[PDB]
Paper text:
Pannexins are a family of ubiquitously expressed large-pore forming channels which regulate nucleotide release during apoptosis, blood pressure, and neuropathic pain.
We further stabilized frPanx1 by truncating the C-terminus by 71 amino acids and by removing 24 amino acids from the intracellular loop between transmembrane helices 2 and 3. Purified frPanx1-ΔLC was reconstituted into nanodiscs composed of MSP2N2 (an engineered derivative of apolipoprotein) and soybean polar lipids, and subjected to cryo-electron microscopy (cryo-EM) and single-particle analysis. We used a total of 90,185 selected particles for 3D reconstruction at 3.0 Å resolution. The map quality was sufficient for de novo model building for the majority of frPanx1-ΔLC with the exception of disordered segments of the N-terminus (residues 1–10), ECL1 (88–100), and ICL1 (157–194). The frPanx1-ΔLC structure revealed a heptameric assembly, which is unique among the known eukaryotic channels. The narrowest constriction is surrounded by Trp74 located on ECL1. Mapping such residues in the [name] structure revealed that they are clustered proximal to the extracellular constriction by Trp74, in a groove formed between ECL1 and ECL2.
Residue numbers in the entry:
A (entry chain B), B (entry chain A): 11 to 87, 101 to 155, 169 to 170, 195 to 357
């Protein structure tokens, strides 16, 4: 009985290439973080070529600096801040979106990695020794992960943070779009604190926001992409209803492994671990041999 | 008896991946250092596009440079320095926050690393040889760390430095917010030292601070994030009341290891070492075998 409990070695950097994120979470994260960076890079580029935020039509009686004053004054205060702070909300949401994958990498990745390596090495050993009564090591190990919750708790944490951030960004951009595309100019007053009773200046002045066009374009692009990537976040968040293949069911054609009685797919570590195992089954060497073998029969 | 005291080798770069910081301290440090850098990067970017700090409405009778003089003069002196020095306090607190993890890395990390490697190699040897009377090497070694204090002293040093810096930054930003969001302009005088009795200049002039909006936004963001990450610092600082799993209790199902009588969780090196051991138990190979083994029984 107890002979295949002795730990010998990993006889290589054998795995070195396990994937610890299910490729859809990976694509979604890359896109959602990258898009605002490209947008605001272009934004800052064009704004540093324009070299101004607004332009006011000052009266000729002013000098240079006397007009620069009103042009700087009217850049301060219907909300104008949804325009003043646009290139900052995007960086903010980009960084907030980068955070959850850091959370994953530092709190769940190494545990999951060790578990995957253990299960895979055990399966390879079992097949290799029984192709030529022991205890169901892998069966009992996977039975242990049937009332724990840490892995799935952390997973759902990451997914819900991502969904919340994307939803908020969407409604912000939407209000921007539905508010600014009706005009781009406004009336500004200057004589307020000391010049209040100074008749040497106009009672009003006009100024125009000179980036509304580009910002509206970027808003449309970002909103479309985000509403496109929301459903994938939800489909990922629905773990116990995804599509699997039961690699543990392909392994049951050898003399003494198991016969998996019946699953239930509840929210627990068993389901998430099975998902990661199926994603990484590309590296299990014995898998293809057993597949063709059960095909011959 | 004395046979398992001979040092043979680490038969690989076996561990090469121990984690020397408990993932919550890691996340907190990354966030707290990174956030002000992103904020002040954006600040310096926008301020170099604006190319000015204030704007004063000089009388038309001035020339160009004669108005530049008042515009530069009134940028000097209710505190205006809380506005003048804003992009510097943030870099200061970022660097002060980076310091404690350097302190940890240089005074505690290598000792802890050697200790972890020793304990883990010893446990693996013990299991591997007794799965097929000796002295409790690991039990006595962990007994030695029961009246020393260096590790926990350094740990608490780092945590309290972090908490102090975060608290001070919070109250600074709070005073900024509660002071500047009532106005953005002030009255300035010029004729003071030589032009005092020079009637060729106005008795007053107005100037406006042209970054109050952006700085207030950054202040809100930073204050919210810092008050969010304070509780985690405290929860970390409360070492002897955290949640563990007693991996040394899972190891006691083999013939001659121990039976852990009773803990007390006082402030000492034993508790902190147990925390680090539980964090790094992902690499102990025998751990999962023993877990499934005690499950079968």
């Amino acid at each position: 009985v107890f002979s295949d409990f002795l730990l010998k070695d990993p006889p290589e950097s054998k795995y070195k290439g396990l994937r610890l994120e299910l490729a859809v979470d990976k694509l979604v994260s890359c896109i959602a973080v990258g898009l605002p960076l490209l947008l605001i890079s272009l934004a800052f580029a064009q704004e540093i070529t324009l070299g101004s935020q607004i332009s006011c039509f000052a009266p000729t009686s002013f000098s240079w600096r006397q007009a620069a004053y009103v042009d700087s004054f009217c850049w301060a205060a219907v909300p104008l801040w949804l325009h003043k702070f646009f290139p900052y909300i995007l960086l903010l949401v980009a960084v907030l979106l980068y955070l959850p994958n850091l959370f994953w990498r530092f709190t769940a990745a190494p545990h999951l990695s060790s578990d995957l390596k253990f299960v895979m090495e055990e399966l390879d050993k079992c097949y290799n020794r029984d192709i030529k009564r022991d205890y169901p090591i892998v069966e009992q190990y996977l039975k242990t992960k049937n009332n724990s919750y840490g892995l799935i708790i952390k997973y759902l944490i990451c997914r819900v943070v991502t969904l919340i951030i994307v939803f908020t960004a969407c409604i912000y951009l939407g209000y921007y779009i539905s508010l600014f595309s009706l005009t781009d100019e406004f009336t500004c007053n200057i004589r307020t604190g000391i010049l209040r009773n100074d008749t040497a200046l106009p009672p009003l002045v006009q100024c125009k926001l000179i980036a509304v066009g580009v910002f509206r374009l970027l808003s449309y692009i970002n909103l479309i992409i985000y509403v496109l990537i929301m459903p994938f976040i939800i489909y990922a968040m629905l773990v116990p209803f995804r599509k699997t293949a039961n690699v543990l069911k392909v392994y049951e054609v050898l003399p003494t492994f198991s016969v998996q009685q019946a699953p239930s797919k509840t929210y627990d570590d068993h389901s998430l671990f099975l998902l990661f195992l199926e994603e990484n089954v590309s590296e299990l060497k014995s898998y293809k041999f057993l597949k063709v073998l059960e095909n011959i029969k």
